[PDB]
């Protein structure tokens, strides 16, 4: 219900305009700072902040001597209303005599990142904000539907613009996006990625802020919406966001027993029908 802040200010540009500064920070979307801690800071003998003003999510501080080395001064804040969405806040620091000499810095929640996640590559900078998908092990668990678990997902409620069966070779990381290098065995459905075929490599990106993982060596089935970014080689790149069907294809080792062979039959019926027919219904 409470969170502790920390404000560090310093200057390495003493050659330019110098003097004092006004540190204007914006608290989180619902928090408001404690007046008691700032009053204790100001009423010190060797006071570091000479003036302050707190109102809602706005805190104003006046630093009369900006040093060259780090000098952090902290306080506390309480919570009034819940944070409706994950977002980074801002903190500006103006120069007293020339307010045009400012410095604005974005900061994030105690566990999130300071900038909105975005898939950026050359000209295209497709957004990657929302939810991240789950690893639905439908085959492993016991469930049954009348061409509804996968055919309905591919042709009734969501419309999947691409679908492949791929093999995971290598795992990597790139900024905040976890990267999976996969090879396409057979193409199930495509709209824009016409050049995709067998023995072709593709990249799958998932935000590194959740638990999704693709083990190496295993074979998966990927289906979802087509992206807008391109790889370094000029080939389309796909983002594993929500409303995307990812499912490991069984290797028949844990399917030969009678119970799961019916589910495997439903699987093969699905893949064959979807590959050969163009999303009926």
């Amino acid at each position, epitope marked *: 219900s409470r969170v502790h802040y920390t404000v560090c200010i310093w200057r390495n540009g003493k050659v330019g305009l110098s003097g004092m500064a006004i540190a204007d920070v914006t608290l989180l979307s619902g928090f408001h700072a404690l007046r*008691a801690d700032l009053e204790k800071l100001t009423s010190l003998s060797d006071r570091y902040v000479s003036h302050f003003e707190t109102e809602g999510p706005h805190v104003l501080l006046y630093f009369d001597s900006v040093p060259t080395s780090r000098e952090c001064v902290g306080f506390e804040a309480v919570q009034e209303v819940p944070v409706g969405l994950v977002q980074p806040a801002s903190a500006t620091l103006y120069d007293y005599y020339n307010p045009e000499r400012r410095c604005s810095v974005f900061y994030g929640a105690p566990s999130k990142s300071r900038l909105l996640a975005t898939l950026c590559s050359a000209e295209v900078c497709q957004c990657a904000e929302g939810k991240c998908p789950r690893q639905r092990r439908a085959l492993e668990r016991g469930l049954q539907d009348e061409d509804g678990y996968r055919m309905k997902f591919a042709c009734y409620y969501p419309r999947v613009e691409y679908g492949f069966q791929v093999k995971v070779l290598r795992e990597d990381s790139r900024a905040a996006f976890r990267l999976f290098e996969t090879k396409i065995t057979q193409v199930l459905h495509f709209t824009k990625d016409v050049k995709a075929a067998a023995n072709q490599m593709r990249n799958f990106l998932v935000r590194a802020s959740c638990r999704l993982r693709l083990e190496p060596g295993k074979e998966y089935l990927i289906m979802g919406l087509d992206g807008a970014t391109y790889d370094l080689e000029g080939h389309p790149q796909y983002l594993l966001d929500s409303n995307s069907w990812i499912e490991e294809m069984p290797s028949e080792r844990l399917c030969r027993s009678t119970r799961q062979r019916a589910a495997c039959a439903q699987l093969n019926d699905f893949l064959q029908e979807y590959g050969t027919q163009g999303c009926q219904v």
Partner: nanobody, 116 residues
Framework: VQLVESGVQAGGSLRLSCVAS????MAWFRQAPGKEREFVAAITSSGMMTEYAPSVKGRFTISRDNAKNTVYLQMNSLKPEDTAVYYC?????????????????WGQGTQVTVSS
């Protein structure tokens, strides 16, 4: 701005108290011979925030008194090999949870010994 601190077989309990003239976020540190001192826990000024070392998670607790302005630290379920000199230190700029040793006007501490 001066700090005064005052206050056993293994598996028992103890309650150290550190008193300071000024009311601030005085934290606790522990120093053992032959090795650099390491923190144990910290508390903010008002007292509604506490952090503890990973080795003592959910074991030691800190409270504060609003009348005499002192910090209390209870160590029920005392572990045999936690013997060290206990210090209470603080700074005047309210850097809550500042793990590294950047606390000014350090205290004198007390020697506490533990027997298995």
């Amino acid at each position: 701005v001066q700090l005064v601190e005052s206050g056993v077989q293994a598996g028992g309990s103890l309650r150290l108290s550190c008193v300071a003239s000024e009311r601030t976020y005085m934290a606790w540190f522990r120093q053992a011979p032959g090795k650099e001192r390491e923190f144990v826990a910290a508390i903010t000024s008002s007292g509604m925030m506490t952090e503890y070392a990973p080795s003592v998670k959910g074991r030691f607790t800190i409270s504060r008194d609003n009348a005499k302005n002192t910090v209390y630290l209870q160590m029920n379920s005392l572990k045999p090999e936690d013997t060290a000199v206990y210090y209470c230190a603080a700074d005047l700029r309210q850097r809550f949870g500042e793990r590294v040793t950047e606390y000014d006007y350090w205290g004198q501490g007390t020697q506490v010994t533990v027997s298995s």
